[PDB]
């Protein structure tokens, strides 16, 4: 829900900035001529930035040691084999690379094995200025690293081709993360339409980070891998750790927990890491089953939960959700649905987004500025009008100031 | 991995714990290069066989290079 | 608009659960040793679940009947052909498979022809526990079925490779579906800013299902194919059939129809199955043309519609929309824009989402708690203050209780 | 933010309409028999529409000039080479095409080099009814054009295969575009929760077009290329040029500028074309650095900006954003945060979306209908009740109409 | 390209100018055709070599054609 | 297919009827296996030709297997 609080980056501004640098006439030669015939220099340029460079395919030479070993006794003959194969499959790579940039207009991700080979990838990961915890991590998860990398077509010149490659740096590793799953909480009372609901909007991934918490509102900009979560900080907000107080006591004075109000009590489920939340409302059929032996729990209206120990499946309405079979312990923490603490009669109809205390404020606003303007109207059938400004000194009597006659 | 989860009945929400971070904070950029040759057409009349199939994978080469050139001279988009 | 009412599943929890099972040391052998040399067993495992298994590529043997038929009189020679070809192109497949899992970190969809061949796919579809209506359906639409399938890299062991494949079950077939298209309805009156609008938010696909209606708010999680709609129930809510009452009479007492209010009267079009809705507001140029002969209708402000019989194109502002040429009959049901029934002066400014009756309630709230607190203020210029608590018994006179002197 | 104001088209309604036409028995032959043996006709059909057609692969002949040149002295022999190669790689193309339609169920984009070759693409671009400014544009950006094109599998018959191809027409070219970037503007005052914010919601691309302005709310349905923006008008609204008045003076009487209100003062950055906006709130650490030499500006709470001249990086919280290095001049236009003009005490809590004047109206509503109903309640401790309707003519005295006795 | 940008402090917004349009307004549709042959199995016992590799790229051909046929007879989706 | 549509002027909405369901309700999972061999390097000095091209498609094989191994031992993501 909270993705519209994200800022907005420019994912390949760094790669493109390296590219821009390669176009200063002198700069390419400097690269070419520094890979003279080492295959991995670390050139520096006109602005004088540290460009680790890396030649992965010499075809100038390979073709100019069989333009020569074939421009002589061909025309024309049969040569042999070995020299086709070695080529065939070098050129091949370049064709793959070339496809990729063609269809993605010069920018690709994940970064392919043709764009950079495990062999090549693992060297880079090896001379990287990073700790060994990182080196290992990247090394045990190359296809993930590929998925977080971009490749950028850069220059094609007389006889150089360069592209920039943007590899993830994992500056934060092995800190404790967690995932918050939420579903709508409503009253379950009987006349369709009388009901009110509230949904914590603060779902996503959360990871401890540099004393604060990094929060990811679109929980699918994070890929889990057994028990490691790969995220990208570009799609995160930095929050006080107090945000976790929302899972301890949603009313806490230290952090103002985000919710959404409505009257739309419709049924659904959220499948968690080790079970299912079920928000069953109205006439909906909501169920949970174990595979071998069918339905084993039937849900009542309101919001409830089953672990994955024994359950394989959960059905809500006409939607069958398979549950994750991941091993872990769940714990069902009993408590009173907080929607039960609110008078429907001055609950906010819909509120895109608010916080617990914002709702509280509106409710005061409404409570107060009703009953003051009500014990105001609890002084009526008991006030009296102005007797004319033409000198008249009547004496209050009858529901009118009549032409008197009795006790004066 | 000691993955655990708590459901909160008060608020219809649940938290799964036990996970370990790997966050992309930054980028390593490095230039990747490929040395090319350019050739004239200077080929052959011929042949027997195994220079007919060599010339082909080399029509292909020129094709590739042609496309990349065609990725002419502007910013690529994020 | 209504996608945020979806719950949230875990698409490959079933496939992954099968995978988890394959890692119990004994389990693989059981698979291997049950495909002894049949090519399609139906093994069972430690928990004892029904794993239909299926060997699609024997290369152990094929390579260990030419490690042997080549580790002998090579070193070294030329053998022949036929044995390359048969291999060349077996291995090839494995390379494709291997690419796919490499770039998608071990999970793919649509499921490719290399991951499972039509030949292989059609057998599976054939021993499936499903009716023949289904078998036919899947059979006449394999690439759709591919598009709804996931493939999951699972284990690579000494000499087994397994991946799980998740195929759609179509448990609901040939029931009547329909599509609801909506556009904003506004007042067309003249001073920019005075206007109000309302948009039914309940757009999507709808299909009859088990006595209820399955509704799909993101109409692009459904692929039409002539006159068959492929949807996935994971992205649906289960509603009472009464929901179709909203297309009969939006004010009906049986179902509370969802709308959105605003003052943002901007122009647009929605291209339907057999025509175009046009919501033309302000200075916008809105038009419809037939191809051969140009503009043939010019729209007035407000919301209107043309069928595709004769029209090829519709233009709104600077946006040219081609219309679908699908054959069908349209019917224009005349009626009075409901936005005409509402006083702008107490219409809700914006309301992310509400229902017809929620709006009605707020409007009462506003009507009432204005005119009561107004025929309250229709008793002023006619009430009188407290005469001092120092014993004074004056007699109302002049707009003040003066020092009297005339009739006592 | 404004994408939900888009209408909704049907991207391949034109291509599909051509397809539908090809299925009228007579129609295909007409195509076949009009490409007799020219390779690019311009057939017309039963309805009589102008179908530019184009045969790109004769394999009937090629295979029926070596079914013949091989069904004779094979069975069986070795023939030569040249005739494999020429085939090998013709068929190859068809396999690629065939993959593509297989995995995308018969509809592809970008349109590939196998689906249409540069060679083929550039001819089409050449006999197109378009000016030469266009021809050049398309010609210098084929992979972009590919990215905006769809290809549509159409018919496979006895020995014809056709697919339709949908190429972009760029009917608007070289007009001035611009990009609006926005971030939240809030009060920076000290007790967490007291703050209010506002965000202009009107971000996107904007281009001058036919006297109006085309606006694109999802700024990623537009691809920049140095200084040319490729957009698609399907995802745009047509606005009065007055919309640019919002960047001159957001309060202007000529156009009602769109904003969103909240109390959610969380920190972020938006990376612009030539710098960074920074919206730093609360305890957040917000910074900007130059690469060689580290932090060089530290932001105060509120919303501020740095150009890319000298800056390489900006950090907000735990998010590091690289800045775009594009050359250009920025200009920081000083002015007073408009959020400073609003009383928090009657600011709207949250409002999904509104306009400056809609907010103004609500604020009046609130200002007014508080202080009228307040200088109403500034007449209390000073009104008096009804003396009984049983004839009594008392004389106001004491805070009650007592049994009098003194001056009558 | 004279790309310029203005930041507005009043409203926390900024405008980058200097760009040139290329808007898709419309479409060029054209039919693209490929002529096919259909063959019986009428092949060979054999061989030596270079008709074993020709027949293969032709098993492949029939495979392709088989798939496309399998994209049977309904609307493709946008 | 008798596809029909009604436009409602009261509410600026329209309904297209005549369609038939095919809803994914569930899943068929089945294990797909491939038997592999593992080889030493035990090859050859040589050759003539058609074991130079066989050994290659077999360098390739080992390459593939190497990657899949590299998809090491964790959950794949939905």
């Amino acid at each position: 829900f909270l993705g519209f609080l994200l800022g907005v980056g420019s994912a390949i501004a760094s790669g493109v900035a390296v590219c821009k640098v390669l176009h200063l006439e002198g700069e390419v030669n400097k690269i070419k001529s520094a890979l003279l015939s080492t295959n991995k220099a670390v050139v520096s340029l006109s602005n004088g930035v540290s460009v680790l460079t890396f030649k992965v395919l010499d075809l100038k030479n390979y073709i100019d040691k069989q333009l020569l070993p074939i421009l002589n006794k061909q025309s024309c003959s049969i040569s042999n084999i070995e020299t086709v194969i070695e080529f065939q499959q070098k050129n091949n790579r370049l064709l793959e690379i070339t496809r990729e940039f063609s269809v993605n207009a010069g920018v690709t991700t994940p970064v392919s094995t043709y764009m950079l080979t495990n062999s090549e990838l693992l060297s880079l990961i090896n001379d990287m200025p990073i700790t060994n915890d990182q080196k290992k991590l990247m090394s045990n998860n190359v296809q993930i690293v590929r998925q977080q990398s971009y490749s950028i077509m850069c220059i094609i010149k007389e006889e150089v081709l360069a592209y920039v490659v943007q590899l993830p740096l994992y500056g934060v590793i092995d800190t404790p993360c967690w995932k918050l799953h939420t579903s709508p909480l409503c009253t379950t009372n009987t006349k369709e339409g009388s009901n009110i609901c509230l949904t914590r909007t603060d779902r996503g991934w959360y990871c401890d980070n540099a004393g604060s918490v990094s929060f990811f509102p679109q929980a699918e900009t994070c890929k889990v891998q057994s028990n490691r979560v790969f995220c990208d900080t570009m799609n995160s907000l930095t929050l006080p750790s107090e945000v976790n107080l929302c899972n301890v006591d949603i009313f806490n004075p230290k952090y103002d927990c985000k919710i959404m109000t409505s009257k739309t009590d419709v049924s659904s489920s959220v499948i968690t890491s080790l079970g299912a939340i079920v928000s069953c409302y109205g006439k909906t059929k909501c169920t949970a089953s174990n595979k071998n032996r069918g339905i084993i729990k039937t849900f009542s209206n309101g919001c409830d939960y089953v672990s994955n120990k024994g359950v394989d499946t959960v059905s809500v309405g006409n939607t069958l959700y398979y549950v994750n079979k991941q091993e872990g312990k769940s714990l069902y923490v009993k408590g009173e649905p907080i929607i039960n603490f609110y008078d429907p009669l001055v609950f906010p109809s819909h509120q895109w987004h608010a916080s617990i205390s914002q709702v509280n404020e509106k409710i005061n606003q409404s409570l107060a500025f009703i009953r003051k303007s009500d014990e105001l109207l609890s002084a009526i059938g008991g006030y009296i009008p102005e007797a004319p400004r033409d000198g008249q000194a009547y004496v209050r009597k009858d529901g009118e100031w009549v032409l008197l006659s009795t006790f004066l | 991995q000691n993955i655990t989860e708590e459901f909160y009945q008060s608020t219809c929400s649940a938290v799964s714990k036990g996970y370990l971070s790997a966050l992309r904070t930054g980028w390593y950029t490095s230039v990747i290069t490929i040395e090319l040759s350019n050739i004239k057409e200077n080929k052959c009349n011929g042949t027997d066989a195994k220079v007919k199939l060599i010339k082909q994978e080399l029509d292909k080469y020129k094709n590739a290079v042609t496309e990349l050139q065609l990725l002419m001279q502007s910013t690529p988009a994020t």
Side-chain angles (χ1 to χ4, degrees), chain A, chain B:
Chain A
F1 293 111
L2 288 189
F4 70 87
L5 304 168
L6 299 169
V8 12
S10 170
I12 69 190
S14 60
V16 173
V18 171
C19 276
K20 281 219 158 83
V21 161
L22 303 198
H23 291 62
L24 307 178
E25 55 173 319
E27 270 40 37
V28 181
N29 325 28
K30 281 193 198 161
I31 299 280
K32 203 122 96 275
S33 72
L35 282 145
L36 19 74
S37 62
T38 181
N39 272 20
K40 339 123 289 235
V42 165
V43 176
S44 225
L45 300 165
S46 45
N47 105 295
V49 283
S50 166
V51 293
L52 182 174
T53 338
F54 180 8
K55 191 211 83 186
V56 286
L57 226 53
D58 208 355
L59 296 195
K60 177 168 90 281
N61 290 349
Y62 185 110
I63 289 169
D64 302 339
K65 58 138 289 306
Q66 54 87 122
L67 176 112
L68 278 263
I70 261 198
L71 199 270
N72 301 39
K73 309 157 74 206
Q74 341 280 308
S75 159
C76 294
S77 234
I78 160 173
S79 168
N80 72 113
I81 211 62
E82 305 139 10
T83 350
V84 194
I85 289 316
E86 205 166 359
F87 186 55
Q88 188 146 112
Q89 77 87 65
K90 269 180 176 284
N91 204 67
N92 167 66
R93 209 220 185 170
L94 159 76
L95 309 194
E96 285 305 70
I97 284 148
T98 295
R99 216 207 292 274
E100 288 189 56
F101 292 142
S102 158
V103 300
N104 307 93
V107 186
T108 83
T109 181
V111 154
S112 81
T113 53
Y114 304 90
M115 206 81 55
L116 210 83
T117 56
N118 305 290
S119 145
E120 289 146 335
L121 181 53
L122 296 146
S123 346
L124 266 167
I125 287 154
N126 238 46
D127 307 334
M128 258 165 43
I130 58 166
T131 120
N132 300 351
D133 274 338
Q134 285 208 52
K135 292 206 216 229
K136 264 3 72 64
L137 177 60
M138 300 188 67
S139 289
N140 301 102
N141 300 99
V142 307
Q143 59 295 129
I144 291 308
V145 178
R146 274 181 197 280
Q147 261 168 352
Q148 306 191 257
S149 314
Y150 287 87
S151 180
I152 316 179
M153 182 54 224
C154 206
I155 28 177
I156 190 39
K157 229 170 179 176
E158 310 199 26
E159 32 182 51
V160 119
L161 159 65
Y163 46 107
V164 175
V165 178
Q166 244 181 235
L167 293 178
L169 264 212
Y170 300 96
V172 170
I173 283 188
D174 294 324
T175 68
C177 294
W178 65 99
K179 205 188 170 189
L180 177 57
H181 315 258
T182 74
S183 212
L185 178 54
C186 314
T187 58
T188 67
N189 83 28
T190 353
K191 164 153 57 43
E192 306 290 14
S194 68
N195 289 314
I196 54 162
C197 316
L198 122 194
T199 298
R200 289 182 65 192
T201 50
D202 68 331
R203 70 208 187 175
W205 278 102
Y206 284 84
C207 300
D208 279 312
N209 192 354
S212 312
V213 162
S214 269
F215 159 60
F216 303 94
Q218 345 171 281
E220 355 74 2
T221 76
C222 282
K223 315 95 168 109
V224 165
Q225 222 92 96
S226 78
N227 75 332
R228 163 101 47 195
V229 228
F230 288 84
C231 301
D232 188 310
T233 54
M234 200 26 70
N235 304 306
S236 68
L237 317 159
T238 315
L239 307 172
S241 43
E242 281 69 48
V243 69
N244 183 68
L245 264 18
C246 297
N247 293 315
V248 163
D249 166 36
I250 200 178
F251 291 106
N252 79 84
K254 276 183 277 153
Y255 194 94
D256 194 20
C257 308
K258 285 88 88 88
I259 68 193
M260 185 179 83
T261 58
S262 73
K263 287 181 140 283
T264 295
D265 61 340
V266 74
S267 292
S268 74
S269 186
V270 164
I271 296 300
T272 65
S273 287
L274 313 169
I277 305 176
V278 174
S279 273
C280 202
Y281 300 116
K283 296 176 181 297
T284 284
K285 203 213 217 304
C286 320
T287 247
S289 297
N290 154 292
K291 47 142 55 201
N292 295 316
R293 301 149 350 286
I295 290 169
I296 67 99
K297 159 171 195 182
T298 300
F299 291 109
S300 293
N301 286 345
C303 172
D304 205 354
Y305 176 84
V306 279
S307 70
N308 63 358
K309 301 251 195 285
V311 166
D312 291 293
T313 254
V314 142
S315 315
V316 177
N318 295 340
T319 307
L320 174 81
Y321 298 90
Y322 283 80
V323 132
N324 287 288
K325 286 303 212 168
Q326 187 64 42
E327 18 289 309
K329 293 129 165 192
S330 313
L331 162 64
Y332 188 126
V333 180
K334 288 177 201 188
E336 230 255 89
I338 81 180
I339 186 80
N340 290 344
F341 305 150
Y342 288 82
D343 183 344
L345 232 123
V346 306
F347 193 65
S349 199
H350 192 113
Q351 260 212 258
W352 190 29
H353 272 90
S355 66
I356 262 108
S357 69
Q358 278 171 276
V359 164
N360 284 353
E361 92 199 342
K362 197 159 281 149
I363 272 175
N364 297 5
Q365 278 168 36
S366 296
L367 246 23
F369 284 118
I370 236 301
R371 331 147 311 98
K372 294 175 195 171
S373 329
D374 158 277
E375 257 200 303
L376 164 172
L377 236 305
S378 196
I380 218 107
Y383 286 114
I384 73 184
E386 155 110 69
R389 296 199 185 101
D390 49 52
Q392 323 252 252
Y394 289 126
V395 271
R396 183 56 183 182
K397 181 182 141 226
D398 306 335
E400 46 173 71
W401 309 70
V402 212
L403 286 160
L404 174 80
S405 206
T406 309
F407 291 108
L408 180 269
Chain B
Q1 60 108 314
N2 289 319
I3 284 181
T4 79
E5 179 165 286
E6 284 177 15
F7 171 74
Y8 309 117
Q9 177 177 51
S10 355
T11 68
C12 195
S13 71
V15 171
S16 333
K17 270 175 219 63
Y19 296 87
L20 290 171
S21 47
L23 318 192
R24 185 198 78 66
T25 68
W27 299 110
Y28 205 62
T29 68
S30 51
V31 172
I32 308 320
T33 42
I34 285 181
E35 271 176 57
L36 310 182
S37 103
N38 13 347
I39 64 169
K40 327 263 204 210
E41 242 76 322
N42 59 301
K43 193 230 311 124
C44 149
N45 315 315
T47 80
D48 183 331
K50 286 53 159 183
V51 294
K52 232 87 185 64
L53 214 138
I54 207 92
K55 53 73 43 49
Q56 179 223 215
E57 186 96 3
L58 193 120
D59 282 338
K60 276 174 172 176
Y61 169 98
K62 286 201 132 162
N63 266 37
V65 176
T66 301
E67 187 82 32
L68 296 168
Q69 254 149 67
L70 250 184
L71 266 57
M72 194 266 155
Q73 101 320 172
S74 264
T75 313
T78 56

